[PDB]
Amino acid sequence: AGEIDESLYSRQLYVLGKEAMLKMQTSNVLILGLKGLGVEIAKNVVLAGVKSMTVFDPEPVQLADLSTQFFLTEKDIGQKRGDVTRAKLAELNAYVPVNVLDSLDDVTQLSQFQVVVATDTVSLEDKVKINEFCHSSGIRFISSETRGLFGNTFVDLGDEFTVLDPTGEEPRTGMVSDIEPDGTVTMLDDNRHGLEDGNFVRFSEVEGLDKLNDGTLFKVEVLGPFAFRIGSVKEYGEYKKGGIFTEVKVPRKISFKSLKQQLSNPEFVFSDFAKFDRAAQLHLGFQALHQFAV
Amino acid sequence: AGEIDESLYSRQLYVLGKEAMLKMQTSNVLILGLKGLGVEIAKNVVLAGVKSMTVFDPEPVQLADLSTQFFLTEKDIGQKRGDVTRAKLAELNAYVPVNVLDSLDDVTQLSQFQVVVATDTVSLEDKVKINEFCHSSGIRFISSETRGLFGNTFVDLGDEFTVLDPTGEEPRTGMVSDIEPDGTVTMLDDNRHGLEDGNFVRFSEVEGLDKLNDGTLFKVEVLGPFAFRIGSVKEYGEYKKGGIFTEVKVPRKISFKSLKQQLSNPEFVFSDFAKFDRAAQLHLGFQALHQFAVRHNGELPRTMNDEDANELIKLVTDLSVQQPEVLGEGVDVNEDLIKELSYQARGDIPGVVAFFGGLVAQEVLKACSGKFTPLKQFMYFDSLESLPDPKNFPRNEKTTQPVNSRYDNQIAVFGLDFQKKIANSKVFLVGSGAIGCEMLKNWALLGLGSGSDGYIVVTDNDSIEKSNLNRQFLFRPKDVGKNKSEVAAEAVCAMNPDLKGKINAKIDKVGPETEEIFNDSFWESLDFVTNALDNVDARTYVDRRCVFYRKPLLESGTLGTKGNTQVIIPRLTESYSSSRDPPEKSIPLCTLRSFPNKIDHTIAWAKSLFQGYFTDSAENVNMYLTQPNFVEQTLKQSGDVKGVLESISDSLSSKPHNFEDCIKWARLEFEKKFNHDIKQLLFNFPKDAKTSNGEPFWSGAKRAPTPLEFDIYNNDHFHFVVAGASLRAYNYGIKSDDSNSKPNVDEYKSVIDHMIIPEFTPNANLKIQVNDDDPDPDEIDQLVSSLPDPSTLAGFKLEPVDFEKDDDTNHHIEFITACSNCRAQNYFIETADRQKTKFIAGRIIPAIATTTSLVTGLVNLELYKLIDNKTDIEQYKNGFVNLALPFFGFSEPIASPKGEYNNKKYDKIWDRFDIKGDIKLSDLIEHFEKDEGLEITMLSYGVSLLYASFFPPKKLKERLNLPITQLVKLVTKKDIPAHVSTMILEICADDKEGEDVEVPFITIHL
Amino acid sequence: AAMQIFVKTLTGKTITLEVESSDTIDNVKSKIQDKEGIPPDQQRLIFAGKQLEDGRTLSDYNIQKESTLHLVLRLRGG
Amino acid sequence: AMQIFVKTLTGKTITLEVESSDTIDNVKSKIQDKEGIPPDQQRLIFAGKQLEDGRTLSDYNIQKESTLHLVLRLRGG
């Protein structure tokens, strides 16, 4: 393959793009725990189209699990959550095989997967072991837990991870009316460039500055809503007319720390800034829930 | 899938990378025309691994197509070129389906493909149609043509194409000592940044500027070799210390113009700057060949025909008048050049086809991947220097005419007599790997050594391994384990049975230890020699011999997309050894022992630990048990005596009895190496430690380490123990609990959990060498008095490990990777995977078939010049290439240095004094006086001095009446091995005026 | 009279030098050493079909301003 | 004489210079001069509150270095 079905993925394709989806279609995902949380995550990932989805949950279905697990019925009570759910996940998307992992006694099995997600059925002790293995092996790790009206999630994509497009927005683009020797680019009449300091742009159709058009990227210094500066262009010639600029999104490398390190030194993203003082309280709280269970 | 077979693609993987090959594996390729050119392109692309290959060529095989089409046989004549070739291309690589497109009447079928390649069989009218459909549909398009010693290629990847990595070079990296508010970055000490204006870099570990480390890219303005500037940084804060910069390659969008547009407005890439004025001429000349064909019902000019050559010159002349811009205002048509194009239009030359086969195949791979910089967009090439002197081998309609022979389109260019001399050549090919197979293929197509006075000898001492298959196209999976040379000789004779019985495949290594096989008679019978090697030593060896025997040598080499050719001509040029190549970077010992900052350092350290633990230890024990003078001999002769004695002691005192014992041993080695040894280093130099000076000791290339706490869930901690235990078991002949399985974590964990790991206690009298420029590397009697007597150990043997990087099941790379990554954890160095550790520890050379094929093609264009015995140094070309750029450059070889003594000129490399017989010393000195005006001052055999003019009378009376061999025996007390047929002597001498003078060396012939 | 010429390496790097047409090849190699760290014995420079030899001048090889020389290497694999 | 930030739903960061007594009205017009959006269409939120036209930055305890968010209603579903 290397092939995407547009008749199915049309509106999603306009969100993610072909390349991102092609990578998705080479990724094997494992989900640990199939109460409501796990099956919601699994439902959305299967819909999105990944190479394969594997589910691990050997616990018996009990009546209470039906609170949020929309693929369980009362007929299923007694049987294993993983098994009963597998077939229903499988109907969501014929392109995505859904398998069941019978056991997790051997941690080495985790090497089959590119992304491992541990939900609320996995103890904090097992989360840490599993994360340690994933992180040191280059497997992407994510965990999540809900409790009543509280919840959290944790992301660790390893020592080396590259973001190829940070926002999914269309690259900004515009017509140029003048380019002064100091690099000052002025917009063609009432058009706003929309760029931000440190974006990059390339050019085409600029007359008089020919190697400005070769695909080289220039770093943007914003002067105002109607002009930005790219640094001297004397060496390139003398502006005459025309020109279009196109923003180019450059790769960015990032590092994540392990669950162990983040338990004692978390980097927070806030869900509601009116409640920021609560993130640190709850990060202690969720740990305490685990100590309570121990 | 997203899966790449490393065992097959290993060497290509280090050239292209995972992501490029993943893209290649989603790309369907279509090749139009399957004569020499198309099959060469197809072979290289099928080898490299694309989703599928489709070939189109419904033309019937004719005998003359075999000139360069190595997959056609005379039995195939009449059948369709595409049908017959299909199965043979399929055999090259099981992962790549090869299909035949039956008909191309419906242009719409082109839409199944991502890259279309139009060869010499497609009319220009059709090229333009196909290119227009491809360009306007988003399909990448390439075309190429060869005509005798001339060739071209055209590339058009469409309106929108993105280059992801322009060079394939390792990104530059470096340590920072300062960043000023204006953004001037200063390197630590003597370290050069290696950047270029317009490069981009990211940062990490820069304290004081925190968001400068977030992955943001900065544009580089270079200030000198040791500083560059990134723009103001006042806004991020203020630099305090530390910092590493890393180069990042950014995407580049480029556009291509259509074939139509470029026919009238070409963008040239030059293949030889010495010839750049010919690009415009040939651009016109190739268009006239197509016009000529439209006027002659599809036919090309006839071979060596003046009437057609004049018409071609007229057509080119009409083009330059219609478009005066193409040659330039007031620039004349180069008629002699156009005339040769016409004369040779029907020629099909192995060398030229190989050059364009490699190039275009690489351009296909670029097109599929965005890896490397595409040719943009026309390249022309000629090798007219390869033509022989017409005095010796005249070229005309008669000598040049066909003979009903697979060699007819080579005869078309060179004439019959010359082709016959190629057939009667005697050659030695040294090596039968990538270049070797390509070379043997080229010689098959040349018919070289097929004549009654000709032969080929090829030698190689290695066997065929799986990774070889990616670029040694003569070998099949079934052939793995057999001998490279033998298999290759068989394969080539299947391509051309004119060589059956004419190729002598040997399996001997070439070097000083095989001179009884490769003896005087052997070397002296040869016309010339060709290298196909992968190490400098063997090259130097062969060069020395070609100098000694006065034989031409054709040399070449590759590294990924880079390559070179060099010709060495007796009595004319420098030899290979005459010049220096840059040496291997050496890592200082203090950096390895105590202060690594790169993964290369932890890998080297790990590789030595591996040798010590599993190879050297075992070898020392076996010597101790079987050599009764071993302790004695060691006390006097070894560098590290205490080292060897401790090693033997430990090996015999801690003998494992089961596999669980090996697990415990490996767990304790982890504690020692990654915990106790580190705490000791910190004890000597605490983190806050200062220098006499007052600066912090732990700065710059010195990274304060932290001791490791074993954690079975860490991949590197686990695999250090697994591989360590399994290798220890091997040494002691103990059966592994994993010998028929993967390793079970809970079982290792069980064993390790019951262990008592001993606490660390420092050694206050231990001292640590910080610089390489300072000192230090009773017990020993005691140490001997702890050795078991060998009688205790009758029949005991340890089995030393032989490092094998290409067997993924033997735990070697597993060990070196885990061992390196653990030390890397100690020192906050990013860990590396097995593929990268294997590359570094195994010293693997990146290799790919495209470059191999192209460079071999160049060698065979030079080979034509040897056959003609050219003595004009200006006709020869050393070649240098990088297909990634793409770049090609050539230079005339360097002449051999000349000297003079008295009135006599000599060649300081190639000349010598040839003395027949085991001459008496006095006769030799007398000869040189009378015949050469040379007063011998010093005479040596290797290292020993046989005569000097300062010897007093008594010593002269001892030596003067002795034959050289007896003289050598008098001084060395050793004999001449009797299999020796010559001895080289070095002399110093004075000329007639009594001044010292450099002179040639002497060869004594017994 | 002083001019600029270029040195391209086999890896794609472009080096800029300032020289006079009367400089020796030795001179030029020394300028390359100060910029790249390579020693003159290890440098191999070619221009227009010729390899540049230590005793000669730029003029001997008709090197003009803006000319591009190539620094090349012998490869060891095969 | 202070600086504040406005982050948009697309990830863009805008920097403004304001005094603590400026009205929401003032701020919205600065956003118009910079982004082109007209004040009636701007929706700005800070610390749990949506900012209303008649008030000042001080009324919402907006301090120097504070970050406001410009958000949108989406029409699909």
Ligand SMILES: *O=P([O])([O])O[C][C]1O[C](N2[C]=NC3=C2N=[C]N=C3[N])[C]([O])[C]1[O]
């Ligand atoms: O570059 P490749 O590894 O594909 O091929 C090189 C080839 O040369 C052989 N070789 C190395 N050293 C040799 C030798 N043959 C004969 N004598 C000596 N000294 C090697 O086995 C490879 O097949």
Ligand SMILES: *O=P([O])([O])O[C][C]1O[C](N2[C]=NC3=C2N=[C]N=C3[N])[C]([O])[C]1[O]
């Ligand atoms: O956002 P989606 O298309 O996935 O879902 C929208 C849904 O709404 C329906 N809809 C649009 N307009 C409507 C309406 N239903 C009833 N009345 C009106 N006026 C539409 O058909 C979609 O299914």
